[PDB]
Structure 1
Amino acid sequence: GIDHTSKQHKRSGHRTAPKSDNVYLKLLVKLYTFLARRTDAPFNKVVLKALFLSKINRPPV
């Protein structure tokens, strides 16, 4: 074995898709994974990660 520095097989604690089953939200992630991967602009990575956020982390503005 190796002398393990840090923990093996640890999930990064960020969600990669919404917990929801909203179809009309799943199409917004099909739009912004295209944008954030094929546009160098950092606005689209922000709105991509913000569409996964749960209702507690998504307070009314």
Structure 2
Amino acid sequence: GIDHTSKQHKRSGHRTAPKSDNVYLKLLVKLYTFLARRTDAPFNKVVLKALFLSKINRPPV
């Protein structure tokens, strides 16, 4: 037995992918996943995370 200090098997709570089935959105996601992995620019990581966002979480500009 282990005296657990935190909840076990807890999901991160952040989206790892778009909820949608838009194939062109998934192509954009795979492009910026490659860029976020192979570059140290935090811009690519920010854009990649924003590509996962829901509609209420991407209000129009």
Deviations 1:21-40 (A, max 9, x none): 00010000110000000001
Structure 2, unaligned runs of 5 or more: none
TM-score normalised by structure 2 residue count: 0.98
TM-score normalised by structure 1 residue count: 0.98
Root-mean-square deviation over aligned CA pairs? 0.4
Deviations 1:1-54 (A, max 9, x none): 100001000001101000000001000011000000000110000000000000
Give the count of matched residue pairs.
Answer: 61
Structure 1, unaligned runs of 5 or more: none
| Identity score, percent | 100
Which residue in the other structure is 1:59 paired with? 59
Structure 1 segments, 4+ long, off by >3 Å, are: none
